[PDB]
mmCIF file of N, CA and C (backbone and C1' of nucleotides) and ligand atoms in Angstrom:
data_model
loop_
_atom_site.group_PDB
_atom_site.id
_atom_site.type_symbol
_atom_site.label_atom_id
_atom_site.label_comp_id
_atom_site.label_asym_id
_atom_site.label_seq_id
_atom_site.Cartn_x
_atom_site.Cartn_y
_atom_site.Cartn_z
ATOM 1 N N UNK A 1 0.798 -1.211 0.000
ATOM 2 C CA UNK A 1 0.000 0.000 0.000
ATOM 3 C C UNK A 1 0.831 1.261 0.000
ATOM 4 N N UNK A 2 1.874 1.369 0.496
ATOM 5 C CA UNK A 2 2.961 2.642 0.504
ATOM 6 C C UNK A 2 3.226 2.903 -0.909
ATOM 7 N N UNK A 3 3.575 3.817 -1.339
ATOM 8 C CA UNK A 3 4.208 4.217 -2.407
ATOM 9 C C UNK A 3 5.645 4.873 -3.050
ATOM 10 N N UNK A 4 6.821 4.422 -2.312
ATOM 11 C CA UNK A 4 7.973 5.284 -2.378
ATOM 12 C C UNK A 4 8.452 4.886 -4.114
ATOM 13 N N UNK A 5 9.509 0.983 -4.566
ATOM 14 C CA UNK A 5 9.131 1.943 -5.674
ATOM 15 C C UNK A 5 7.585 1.916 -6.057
ATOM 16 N N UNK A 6 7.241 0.524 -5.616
ATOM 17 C CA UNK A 6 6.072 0.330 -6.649
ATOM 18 C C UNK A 6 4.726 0.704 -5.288
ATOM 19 N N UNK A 7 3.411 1.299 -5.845
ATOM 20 C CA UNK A 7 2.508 1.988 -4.938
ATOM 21 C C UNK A 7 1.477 1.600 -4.832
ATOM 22 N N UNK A 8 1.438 -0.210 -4.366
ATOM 23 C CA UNK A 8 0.081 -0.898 -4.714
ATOM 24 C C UNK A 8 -0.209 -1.031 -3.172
ATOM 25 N N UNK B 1 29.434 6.522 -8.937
ATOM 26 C CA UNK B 1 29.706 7.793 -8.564
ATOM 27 C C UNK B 1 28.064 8.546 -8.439
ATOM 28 N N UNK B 2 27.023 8.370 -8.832
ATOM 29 C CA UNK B 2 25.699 8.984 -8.365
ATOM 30 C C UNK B 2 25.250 8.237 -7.112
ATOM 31 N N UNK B 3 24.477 9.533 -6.516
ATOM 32 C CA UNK B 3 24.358 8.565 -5.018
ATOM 33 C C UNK B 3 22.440 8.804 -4.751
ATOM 34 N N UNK B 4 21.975 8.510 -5.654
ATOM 35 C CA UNK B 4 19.994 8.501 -5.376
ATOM 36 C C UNK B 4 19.770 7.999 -4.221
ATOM 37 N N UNK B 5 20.785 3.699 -4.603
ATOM 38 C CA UNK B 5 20.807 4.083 -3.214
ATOM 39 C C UNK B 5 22.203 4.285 -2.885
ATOM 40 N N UNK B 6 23.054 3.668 -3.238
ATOM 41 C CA UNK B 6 24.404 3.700 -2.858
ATOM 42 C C UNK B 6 24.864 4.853 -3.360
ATOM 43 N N UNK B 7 26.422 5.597 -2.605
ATOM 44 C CA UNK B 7 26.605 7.026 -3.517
ATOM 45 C C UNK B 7 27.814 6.675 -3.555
ATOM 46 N N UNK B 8 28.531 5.842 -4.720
ATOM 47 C CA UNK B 8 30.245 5.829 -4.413
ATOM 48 C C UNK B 8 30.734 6.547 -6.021
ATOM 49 O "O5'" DG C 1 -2.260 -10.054 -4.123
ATOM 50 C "C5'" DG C 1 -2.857 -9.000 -3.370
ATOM 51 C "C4'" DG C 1 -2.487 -7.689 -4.044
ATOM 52 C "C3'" DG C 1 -1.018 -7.607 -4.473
ATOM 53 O "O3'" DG C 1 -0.972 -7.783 -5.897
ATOM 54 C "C1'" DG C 1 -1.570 -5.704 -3.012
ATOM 55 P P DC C 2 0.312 -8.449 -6.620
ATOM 56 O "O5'" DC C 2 1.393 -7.372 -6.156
ATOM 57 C "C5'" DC C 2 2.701 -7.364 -6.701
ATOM 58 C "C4'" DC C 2 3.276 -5.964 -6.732
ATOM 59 C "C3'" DC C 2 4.672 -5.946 -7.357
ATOM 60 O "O3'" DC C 2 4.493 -5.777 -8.759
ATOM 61 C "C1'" DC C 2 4.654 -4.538 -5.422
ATOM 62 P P DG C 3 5.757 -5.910 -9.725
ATOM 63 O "O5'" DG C 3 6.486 -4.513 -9.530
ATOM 64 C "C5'" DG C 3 7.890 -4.367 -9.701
ATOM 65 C "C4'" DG C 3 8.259 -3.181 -8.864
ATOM 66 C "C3'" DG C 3 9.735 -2.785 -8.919
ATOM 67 O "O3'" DG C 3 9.833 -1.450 -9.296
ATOM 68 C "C1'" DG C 3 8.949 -2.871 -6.704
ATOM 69 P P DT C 4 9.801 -1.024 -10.836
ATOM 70 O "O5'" DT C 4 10.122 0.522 -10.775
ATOM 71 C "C5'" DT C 4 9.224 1.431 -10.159
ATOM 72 C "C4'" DT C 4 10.007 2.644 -9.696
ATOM 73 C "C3'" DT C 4 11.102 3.044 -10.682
ATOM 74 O "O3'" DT C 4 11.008 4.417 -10.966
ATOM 75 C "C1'" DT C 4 12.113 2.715 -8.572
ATOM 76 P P DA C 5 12.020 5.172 -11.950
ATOM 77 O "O5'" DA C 5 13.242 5.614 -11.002
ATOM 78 C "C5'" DA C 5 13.047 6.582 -9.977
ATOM 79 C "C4'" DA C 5 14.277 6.660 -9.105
ATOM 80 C "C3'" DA C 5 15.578 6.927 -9.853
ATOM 81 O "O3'" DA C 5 15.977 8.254 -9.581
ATOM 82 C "C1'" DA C 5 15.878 5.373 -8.084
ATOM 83 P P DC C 6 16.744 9.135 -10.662
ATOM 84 O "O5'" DC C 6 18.118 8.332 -10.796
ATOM 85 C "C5'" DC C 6 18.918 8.756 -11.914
ATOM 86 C "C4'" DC C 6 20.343 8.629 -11.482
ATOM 87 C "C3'" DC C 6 21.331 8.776 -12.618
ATOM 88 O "O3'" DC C 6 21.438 10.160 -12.852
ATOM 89 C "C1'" DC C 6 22.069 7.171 -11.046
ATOM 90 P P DG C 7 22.356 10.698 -14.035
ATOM 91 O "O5'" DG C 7 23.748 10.735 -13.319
ATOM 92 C "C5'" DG C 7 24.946 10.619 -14.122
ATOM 93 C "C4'" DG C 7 25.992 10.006 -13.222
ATOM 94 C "C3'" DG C 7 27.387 9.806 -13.815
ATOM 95 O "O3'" DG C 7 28.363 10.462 -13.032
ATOM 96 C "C1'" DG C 7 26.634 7.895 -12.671
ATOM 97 P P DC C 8 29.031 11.848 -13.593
ATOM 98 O "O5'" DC C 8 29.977 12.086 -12.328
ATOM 99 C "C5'" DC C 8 29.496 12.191 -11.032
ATOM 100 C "C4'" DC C 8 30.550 11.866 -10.010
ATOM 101 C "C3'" DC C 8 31.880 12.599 -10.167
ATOM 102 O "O3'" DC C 8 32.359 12.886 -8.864
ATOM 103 C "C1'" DC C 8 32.227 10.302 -10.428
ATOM 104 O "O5'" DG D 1 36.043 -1.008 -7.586
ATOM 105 C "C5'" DG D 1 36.101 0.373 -7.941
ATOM 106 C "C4'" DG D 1 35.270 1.142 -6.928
ATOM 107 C "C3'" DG D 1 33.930 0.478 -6.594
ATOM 108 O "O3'" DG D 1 34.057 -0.125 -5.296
ATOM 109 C "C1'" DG D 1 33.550 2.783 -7.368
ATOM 110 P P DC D 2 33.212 -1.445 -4.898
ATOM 111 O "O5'" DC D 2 31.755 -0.824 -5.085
ATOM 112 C "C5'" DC D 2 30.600 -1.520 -4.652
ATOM 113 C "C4'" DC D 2 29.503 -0.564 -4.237
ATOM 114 C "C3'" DC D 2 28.269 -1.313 -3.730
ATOM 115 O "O3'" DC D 2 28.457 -1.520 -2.335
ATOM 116 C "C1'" DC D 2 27.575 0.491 -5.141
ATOM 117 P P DG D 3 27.427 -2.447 -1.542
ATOM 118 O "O5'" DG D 3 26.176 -1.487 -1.352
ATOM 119 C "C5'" DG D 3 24.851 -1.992 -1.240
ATOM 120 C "C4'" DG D 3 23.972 -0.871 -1.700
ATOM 121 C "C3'" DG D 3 22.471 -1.155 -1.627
ATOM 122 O "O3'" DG D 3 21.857 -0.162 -0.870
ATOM 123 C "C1'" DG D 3 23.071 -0.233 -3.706
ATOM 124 P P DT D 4 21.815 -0.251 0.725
ATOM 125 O "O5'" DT D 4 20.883 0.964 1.115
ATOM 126 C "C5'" DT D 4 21.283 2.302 0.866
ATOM 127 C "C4'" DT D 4 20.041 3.163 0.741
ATOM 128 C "C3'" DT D 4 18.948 2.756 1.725
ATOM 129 O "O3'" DT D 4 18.486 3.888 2.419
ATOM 130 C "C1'" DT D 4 18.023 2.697 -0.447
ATOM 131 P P DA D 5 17.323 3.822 3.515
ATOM 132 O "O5'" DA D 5 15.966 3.987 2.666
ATOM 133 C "C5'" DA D 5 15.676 5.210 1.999
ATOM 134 C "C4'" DA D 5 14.468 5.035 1.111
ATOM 135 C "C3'" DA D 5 13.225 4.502 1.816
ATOM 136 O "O3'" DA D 5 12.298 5.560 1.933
ATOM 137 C "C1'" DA D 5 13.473 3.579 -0.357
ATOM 138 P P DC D 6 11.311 5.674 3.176
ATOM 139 O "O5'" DC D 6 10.402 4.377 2.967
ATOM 140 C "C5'" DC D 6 9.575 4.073 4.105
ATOM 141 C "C4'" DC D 6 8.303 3.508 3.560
ATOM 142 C "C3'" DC D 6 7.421 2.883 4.618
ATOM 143 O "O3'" DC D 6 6.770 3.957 5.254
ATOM 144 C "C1'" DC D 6 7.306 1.677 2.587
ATOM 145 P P DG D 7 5.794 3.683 6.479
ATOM 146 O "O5'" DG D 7 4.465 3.358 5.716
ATOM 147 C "C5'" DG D 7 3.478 2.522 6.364
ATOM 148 C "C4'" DG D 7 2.719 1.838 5.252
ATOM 149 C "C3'" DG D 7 1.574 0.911 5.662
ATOM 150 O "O3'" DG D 7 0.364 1.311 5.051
ATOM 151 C "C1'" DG D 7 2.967 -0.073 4.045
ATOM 152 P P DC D 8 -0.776 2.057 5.960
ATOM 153 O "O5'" DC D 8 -1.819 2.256 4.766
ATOM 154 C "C5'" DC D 8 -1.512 2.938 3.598
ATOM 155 C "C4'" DC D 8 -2.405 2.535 2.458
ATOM 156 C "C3'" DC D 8 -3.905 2.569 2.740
ATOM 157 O "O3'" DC D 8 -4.546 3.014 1.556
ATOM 158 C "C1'" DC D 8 -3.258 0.373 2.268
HETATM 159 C C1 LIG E 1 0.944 -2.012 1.103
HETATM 160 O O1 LIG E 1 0.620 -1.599 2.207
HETATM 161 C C2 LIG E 1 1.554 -3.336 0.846
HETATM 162 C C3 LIG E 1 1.926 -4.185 1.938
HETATM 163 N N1 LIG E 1 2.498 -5.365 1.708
HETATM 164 C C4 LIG E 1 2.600 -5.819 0.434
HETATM 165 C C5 LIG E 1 3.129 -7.084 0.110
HETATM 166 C C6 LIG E 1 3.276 -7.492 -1.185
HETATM 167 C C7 LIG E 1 2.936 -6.640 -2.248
HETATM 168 C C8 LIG E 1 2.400 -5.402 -1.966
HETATM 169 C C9 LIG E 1 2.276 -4.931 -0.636
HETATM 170 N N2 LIG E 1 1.711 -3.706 -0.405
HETATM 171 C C1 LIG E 2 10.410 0.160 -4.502
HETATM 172 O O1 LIG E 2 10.763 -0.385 -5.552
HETATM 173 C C2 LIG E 2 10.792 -0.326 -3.159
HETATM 174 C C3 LIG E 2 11.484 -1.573 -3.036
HETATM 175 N N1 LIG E 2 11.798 -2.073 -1.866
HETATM 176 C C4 LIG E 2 11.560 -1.264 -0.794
HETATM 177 C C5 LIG E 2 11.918 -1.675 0.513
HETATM 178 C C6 LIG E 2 11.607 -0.927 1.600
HETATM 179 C C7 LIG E 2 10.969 0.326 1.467
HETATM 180 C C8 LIG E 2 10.587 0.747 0.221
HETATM 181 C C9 LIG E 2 10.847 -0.034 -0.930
HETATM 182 N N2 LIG E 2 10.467 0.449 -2.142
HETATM 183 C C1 LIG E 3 29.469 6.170 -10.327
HETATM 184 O O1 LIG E 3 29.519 6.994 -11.229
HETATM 185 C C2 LIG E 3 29.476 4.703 -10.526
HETATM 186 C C3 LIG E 3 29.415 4.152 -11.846
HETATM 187 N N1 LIG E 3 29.396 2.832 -12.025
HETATM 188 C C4 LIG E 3 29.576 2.014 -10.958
HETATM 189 C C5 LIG E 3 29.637 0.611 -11.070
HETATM 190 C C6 LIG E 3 29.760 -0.193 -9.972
HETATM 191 C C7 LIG E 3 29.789 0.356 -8.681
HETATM 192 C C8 LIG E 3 29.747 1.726 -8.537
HETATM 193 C C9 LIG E 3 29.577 2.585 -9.649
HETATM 194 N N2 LIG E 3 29.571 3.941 -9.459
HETATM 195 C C1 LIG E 4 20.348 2.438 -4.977
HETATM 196 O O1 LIG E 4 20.322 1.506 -4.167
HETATM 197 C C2 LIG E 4 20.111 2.271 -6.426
HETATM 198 C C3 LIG E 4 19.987 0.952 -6.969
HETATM 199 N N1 LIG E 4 19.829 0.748 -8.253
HETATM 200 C C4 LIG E 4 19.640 1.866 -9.010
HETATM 201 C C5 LIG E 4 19.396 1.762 -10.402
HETATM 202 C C6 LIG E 4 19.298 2.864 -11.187
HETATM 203 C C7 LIG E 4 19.371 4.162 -10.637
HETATM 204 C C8 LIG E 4 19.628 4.304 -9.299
HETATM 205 C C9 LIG E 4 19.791 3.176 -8.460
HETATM 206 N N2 LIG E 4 20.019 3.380 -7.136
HETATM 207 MG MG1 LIG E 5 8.889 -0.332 -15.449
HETATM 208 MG MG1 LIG E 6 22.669 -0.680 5.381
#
DNA sequence: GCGTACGC
DNA sequence: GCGTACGC
């Protein structure tokens, strides 16, 4: 759920 | 030599 | 529920 | 001359 690489 | 993770 | 980010 | 960055 975070998004810094991927923002799923 | 670029440091965005490592910076050497 | 998945992976992006740079060259001295 | 090497790898850091987050949770809905
Ligand atoms: C987001 O909060 C989140 C948490 N754990 C995960 C595991 C695997 C793929 C994506 C994920 N996203
Ligand atoms: C993005 O591609 C990515 C990959 N691994 C991670 C680890 C910990 C925090 C954030 C991250 N983001
Ligand atoms: C920095 O400019 C740079 C370029 N190529 C590399 C290859 C391997 C390790 C570190 C590097 N740093
Ligand atoms: C830092 O850990 C890191 C790792 N791989 C990369 C690829 C391309 C651009 C920057 C990067 N930084
Ligand atoms: Mg891609
Ligand atoms: Mg460390």
């Amino acid at each position: 759920x975070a998004x810094v690489x991927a923002x799923v």
